[PDB]
Scaffold this active site. Sequence first.
Site, mmCIF file in Angstrom:
data_model
loop_
_atom_site.group_PDB
_atom_site.id
_atom_site.type_symbol
_atom_site.label_atom_id
_atom_site.label_comp_id
_atom_site.label_asym_id
_atom_site.label_seq_id
_atom_site.Cartn_x
_atom_site.Cartn_y
_atom_site.Cartn_z
ATOM 1 N N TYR A 16 13.171 -19.249 -5.968
ATOM 2 C CA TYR A 16 11.989 -18.543 -6.447
ATOM 3 C C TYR A 16 12.378 -17.513 -7.506
ATOM 4 C CZ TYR A 16 7.641 -15.852 -6.282
ATOM 5 O OH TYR A 16 6.498 -15.175 -6.605
ATOM 6 N N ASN A 48 -2.824 -17.370 -1.556
ATOM 7 C CA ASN A 48 -1.395 -17.463 -1.252
ATOM 8 C C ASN A 48 -1.012 -16.243 -0.401
ATOM 9 O OD1 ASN A 48 1.440 -18.456 -1.631
ATOM 10 N ND2 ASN A 48 1.672 -16.553 -2.795
ATOM 11 N N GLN A 49 -1.596 -15.104 -0.750
ATOM 12 C CA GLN A 49 -1.334 -13.881 -0.009
ATOM 13 C C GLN A 49 -2.537 -13.725 0.906
ATOM 14 O OE1 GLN A 49 0.044 -10.440 -2.265
ATOM 15 N NE2 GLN A 49 0.567 -11.763 -3.987
ATOM 16 N N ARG A 63 -3.569 26.835 25.679
ATOM 17 C CA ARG A 63 -3.032 26.238 26.887
ATOM 18 C C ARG A 63 -2.554 24.792 26.750
ATOM 19 N NH1 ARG A 63 -6.255 24.594 31.616
ATOM 20 N NH2 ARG A 63 -7.990 25.861 30.805
ATOM 21 N N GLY A 120 4.262 -16.602 -7.147
ATOM 22 C CA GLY A 120 3.116 -16.788 -6.271
ATOM 23 C C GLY A 120 2.715 -18.246 -6.136
HETATM 24 N N1 LIG Z 1 -9.629 20.437 32.973
HETATM 25 C C1 LIG Z 1 -10.224 21.609 33.686
HETATM 26 P P1 LIG Z 1 -8.957 22.907 33.686
HETATM 27 O O1 LIG Z 1 -7.816 22.394 34.537
HETATM 28 O O2 LIG Z 1 -9.618 24.149 34.216
HETATM 29 O O3 LIG Z 1 -8.538 23.091 32.239
HETATM 30 C C2 LIG Z 1 -11.496 22.140 32.956
HETATM 31 C C3 LIG Z 1 -12.607 21.753 33.896
HETATM 32 C C4 LIG Z 1 -13.994 21.848 33.703
HETATM 33 C C5 LIG Z 1 -14.843 21.405 34.761
HETATM 34 C C6 LIG Z 1 -14.315 20.911 35.996
HETATM 35 C C7 LIG Z 1 -12.917 20.809 36.208
HETATM 36 C C8 LIG Z 1 -12.055 21.242 35.181
HETATM 37 C C9 LIG Z 1 -10.560 21.238 35.150
HETATM 38 N N1 LIG Z 2 5.589 -11.467 -2.892
HETATM 39 C C1 LIG Z 2 5.757 -12.618 -3.827
HETATM 40 P P1 LIG Z 2 6.624 -13.910 -2.888
HETATM 41 O O1 LIG Z 2 8.040 -13.410 -2.686
HETATM 42 O O2 LIG Z 2 6.518 -15.177 -3.697
HETATM 43 O O3 LIG Z 2 5.882 -14.048 -1.570
HETATM 44 C C2 LIG Z 2 4.377 -13.165 -4.305
HETATM 45 C C3 LIG Z 2 4.335 -12.754 -5.757
HETATM 46 C C4 LIG Z 2 3.269 -12.840 -6.669
HETATM 47 C C5 LIG Z 2 3.492 -12.374 -7.997
HETATM 48 C C6 LIG Z 2 4.757 -11.844 -8.412
HETATM 49 C C7 LIG Z 2 5.846 -11.748 -7.505
HETATM 50 C C8 LIG Z 2 5.653 -12.201 -6.184
HETATM 51 C C9 LIG Z 2 6.626 -12.208 -5.041
#
Ligand SMILES: *NC1(P(=O)(O)O)Cc2ccccc2C1
Ligand SMILES: *NC1(P(=O)(O)O)Cc2ccccc2C1
Lengths: 514, 513, 513
Positions: free
Chosen positions: A54, A426-427, A294, A61
Amino acid sequence: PKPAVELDRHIDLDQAHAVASGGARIVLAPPARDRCRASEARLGAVIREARHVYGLTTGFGPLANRLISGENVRTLQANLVHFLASGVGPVLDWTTARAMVLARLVSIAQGASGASEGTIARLIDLLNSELAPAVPSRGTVGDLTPLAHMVLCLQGRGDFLDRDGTRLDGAEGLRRGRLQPLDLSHRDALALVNGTSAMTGIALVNAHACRHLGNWAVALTALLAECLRGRTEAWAAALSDLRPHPGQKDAAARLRARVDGSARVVRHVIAERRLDAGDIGTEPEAGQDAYSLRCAPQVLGAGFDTLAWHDRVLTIELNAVTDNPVFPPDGSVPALHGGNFMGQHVALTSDALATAVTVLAGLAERQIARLTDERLNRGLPPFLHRGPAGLNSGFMGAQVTATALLAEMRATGPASIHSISTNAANQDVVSLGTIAARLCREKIDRWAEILAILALCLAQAAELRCGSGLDGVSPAGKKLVQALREQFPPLETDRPLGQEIAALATHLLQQSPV
Amino acid sequence: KPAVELDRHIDLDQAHAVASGGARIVLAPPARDRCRASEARLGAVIREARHVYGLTTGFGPLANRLISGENVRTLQANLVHFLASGVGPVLDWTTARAMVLARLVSIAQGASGASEGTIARLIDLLNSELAPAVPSRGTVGDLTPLAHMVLCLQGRGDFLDRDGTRLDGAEGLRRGRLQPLDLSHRDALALVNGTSAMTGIALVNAHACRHLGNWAVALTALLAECLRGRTEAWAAALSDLRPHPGQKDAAARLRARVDGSARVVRHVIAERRLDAGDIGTEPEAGQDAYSLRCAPQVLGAGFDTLAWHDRVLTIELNAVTDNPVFPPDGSVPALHGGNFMGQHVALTSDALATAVTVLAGLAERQIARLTDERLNRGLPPFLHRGPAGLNSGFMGAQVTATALLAEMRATGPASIHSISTNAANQDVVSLGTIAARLCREKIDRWAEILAILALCLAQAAELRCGSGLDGVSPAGKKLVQALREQFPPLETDRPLGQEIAALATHLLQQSPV
Amino acid sequence: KPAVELDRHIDLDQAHAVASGGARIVLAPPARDRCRASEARLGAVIREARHVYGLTTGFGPLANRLISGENVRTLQANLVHFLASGVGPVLDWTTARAMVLARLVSIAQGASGASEGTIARLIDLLNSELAPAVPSRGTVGDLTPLAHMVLCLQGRGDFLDRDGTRLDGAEGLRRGRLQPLDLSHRDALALVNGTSAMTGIALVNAHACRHLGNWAVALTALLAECLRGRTEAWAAALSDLRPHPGQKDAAARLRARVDGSARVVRHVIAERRLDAGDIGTEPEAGQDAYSLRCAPQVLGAGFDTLAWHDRVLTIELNAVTDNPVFPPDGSVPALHGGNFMGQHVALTSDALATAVTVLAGLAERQIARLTDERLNRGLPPFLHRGPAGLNSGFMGAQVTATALLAEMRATGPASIHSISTNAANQDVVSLGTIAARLCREKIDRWAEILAILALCLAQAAELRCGSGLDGVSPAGKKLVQALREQFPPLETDRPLGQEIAALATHLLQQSPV
Ligand SMILES: *NC1(P(=O)(O)O)Cc2ccccc2C1
Ligand SMILES: *NC1(P(=O)(O)O)Cc2ccccc2C1
Ligand SMILES: *NC1(P(=O)(O)O)Cc2ccccc2C1
């Protein structure tokens, strides 16, 4: 002088970013130089033998069924660079463009691309200079387009960027940086273009920015606790042990370290207090903080674990051979045809990191919202203003700006799910990894701005709460506020903060608070 | 029936085996001992009147209202009551049971203070053939669903039999031979303050993805056999050059699937030396389109995302997600924090959902190529049999596959939508339960797209190689023959909707082996 | 029962009355005659062997395969078969019937060539108490769902009763006293090639939104009565300065709801002249927060989107969405085009979905404000009764509302995901059916959030004004009294999930009048 990175086989992300940002020079290790010379010799033999390969004896391509005579290979490859240069949009930034060049260099240094010494030297020279190629950011489905533009730049047929983003024409670039025009031989053209170098380059810059922003996210959460009498027991190591996510344990440990020495946080474990009949009633505050303090270890930790995954994958991709076709060093076959240019790995990790960044930016946004709310900030002035209230509104405008930045971040989702069959089917499947990496970068930029607003708010809050002397603030906290105040003055009266926010954000992306 | 002994750690396969009823569950002696010790600790904390959330305080922002010991029973009874505000379709039998299992594992670590009786009720439920009937919506990530689970376990809520048929609480306790939940001390809070619902949903997603992944590989392999695919793109040497674990594995599994096949192209094209006479336009290009050539890279990225998802889930499943928590070492009477914040499962679920959508995209494009007469190298248009025009074969099914994919794409990550709630006390929330549920919906759509691809391939293989499947690999033959035991060839146009649905259900629970 | 006579035009209320079984449907003489005329034209086209899609050609890209008249019945019989590849939960009774109605209206325009028998089968279905059981997924926008509809009408598919319970085909025809559908000429393609499914879903969405919109206005007004809201923000003068029709309407309806209230503040603040003695900090700001002050604007933008949606939907419902079509004037034998492309319903459904999410967000913030003791001006935290701490009231329900909104936000527009399919023949598709279904899901979530706000407001009203609702407007009193007929006050903590679901169902079907 300047640090030097010697490339052999493996380079880590810090070394890569050091070279891309110009902090370190790069050198190809002797063993690597030899492996490439050996591959260069293999390409030559493949061509001389007129093997069906190639890009060397076929069209590109879907036009690969059109075989090409050896006499026309020069033209074939010259046209390749031409028809692929259809990119549009703003050019990649200096560091990122260089990161892309580096990524292609590393893939080549593995010795399976057939690149000539001259071609490899041109990439190294660019990296050691103060320049970067000016390449359009849009156009690829994931990275032919951006790389084709890079080639034109290196030939002096495209613009260059200096560290400031100012453009230099091709001739001026080669001149100023003492770069020799790229002289393409054999398949150098396809070798320099058929990989995942652009997205990989963008992702490594994203990885580096995220590390710094994460450090600020931690440092600012810690300072927030010092401004709102936060409870440190929620950050106890014992809790991390019970839910052993590496990122959580790390986040909690880093938070504890930040407030070490503080006389502003609450360090008492509430369960030690024994209650009696006289204690039954309504207390001023609940025994635990709201989630923005926290649950910081759990939220920041999830983000850090996403970044860790992103970096593990990126490390492999940076040091891999993303090219097609490839020439096996062992010489088992003249060449192998496959799809190592498919950037699905960086596409999925960039999208994942993007989501994590949005989640963490949301945390900072809520931290700002709580700190500036006179009904929630436990005694601080509304919007941390100074001077007469009403006449002065302090950070009220900036608080809304933070919300606006977050809202915009949320409007954009994963890029990877939008594959569309193209190139005459091709691509039929594409990764859009470059788009994914770029979208992630934009979110990282918004996050830096939100953190910047939080930082300015906290500097003011710390002084309002503890006086200009920052009495009771931890050593780390004192150093952070002091450093900020070296460039950003207290808000004694209302003033435009837009430019300061932007300036601070730029800093946050490049350095951590230490 | 096999038995899973729960001590400290349980892997994802053991978890699903218990949740799906494939194995009984037993609490290992060491775990029972640690739990009894924790129960003793909670008792001490209560006797000492320590200031502890849920034992001497109200909930959420109301925690500043201290509560006297004589009123704790009422407090915890009301907790279950006000939290039971969930709505929506109930979680399916396996997922609801996985949720129960997840809470048990968190408790078994011995830092929650749950009584032996409460632990036993969870074990009994998992050893029965029932599952609590709990609404799927209501939590910001899992008080709501868990509160409903408690009501069910007290016989004040419906149960689900393996088939999904609902039974009332009383009938559930009777039929499953379950004793009503008798909550003591903080059992109410222990049973409710964790990430057990999202963890339960995610472990079911993990198991389903492993099977669908195997199908994605098996069908990509069969596709190659039906379209003369080139195996050099799947060579191990390429994997070594770009060593992503998922890519190496996908390539290796693809090669294994087509081993013994005479229908694929194994020649390395670079071996061919060209002559001047050969220069011109050849019938076909030397490489396949991406849906075949880049399968290792696309499938591999999906496999690495699932690997990350599973590493994180394994830690979460075996962690103590509760608040407050009681340190086994007795360092402090209790710790107040936020281990109930399911941000880890939220992010991994979102990432997995994206990967699922990408892989569904690959299978959708594989169907599109196989059924296009301009691209399927000589196969009938839409793989029809009988007279063309009069018969359209899989033309309708192909559009259905595109429709399923487009729908998956309309839903994005759940995690980015945190909203401050609970009077700003929960100013950031994970939305992990929603994330896992959305990922589950995408997984279901992916199974339907794969089912369509599978039925198309069984027809294609016979059209290309005859009913005897001449030249087809042993693995390929076995897969087709297996499908044909329940799904007849398409000799004439017929409704495929029901067959697509039936096969999809199978793909989610079993791999092609 | 009432009867809707179909001639040429039918409005959305008339359409939903028929679909919901509230009214019978009758084909007006003029409609019967223009249809008989079309039937005659179809017969002529067939007799003359005109080159017409579906009558002398294959389907989709196979249309290049011409067919002999001796195989047309087989052709159309297979059409219904291969298209029946639908999967997923069946469309609800009212929506499935709305779909049948939309196809009937399209046919009534007299350009489809449908026979009298086929038309009679659709009318009989609508006049029965049944609805066809059709899968919701499969189309790119509506061959699939309609094909399943045909099978149901031939007695080869399930039917649904008003409760959603399924009946087999034979039982459906028997119980409904229906005759099996006997397809002739192109009836098959005529019953299948249009935008009827998405139109049916959208018309059900339109109706539901009207009721929820009325509840959104009624609850915002009651909120003002519970929080000493300022009515000057809802003044007509403000509407006139920014004349958006929806805003003017929202403000007017809001003013009407609080007429007679002694609980809202009616003084324009600018009337007050200040003097040295007034300078200082007042207890409250002179204007309310946005959830009250900006309601005319937010609700109005939503109302203007719905208005646009209904304008476009009205045209779509009464249009001919079929291909090919047989011009009533006889200018040509038939026309081939793309009137089946549901891009209009796709785009309006997506726009409406966004508006619904926005308004649900307003309701969610109103709940957040009302239940927050720091923001609700003296009301109990989470509107609890009994001792605080021991009782948490609506604290669970408030979080559930947030969870419901977050989930709505995870899903975006369906229209942007067009994917080339059908061997590239359908290289652009509307995905209108998916767009309408996603909109419906958001509407259901909005109803649940509004239900939570309604229960919170009933409690808040009594807590603020006493059981006698002293000072509450006549409209507010009537609303609370109506709710209390089925939903008791929250004297102590209890599970609210079932009540929220029940109320949501009511809100979608009736307004607070
Ligand atoms: N995720 C909590 P935290 O552990 O206090 O941060 C916040 C919350 C709100 C309502 C009920 C339970 C929790 C735990
Ligand atoms: N990526 C390529 P390939 O290596 O042939 O897959 C496709 C392409 C298209 C135009 C110019 C260069 C490439 C390399
Ligand atoms: N929508 C149609 P068209 O009228 O040909 O455009 C395409 C299609 C494909 C299968 C079955 C019926 C039709 C009608």
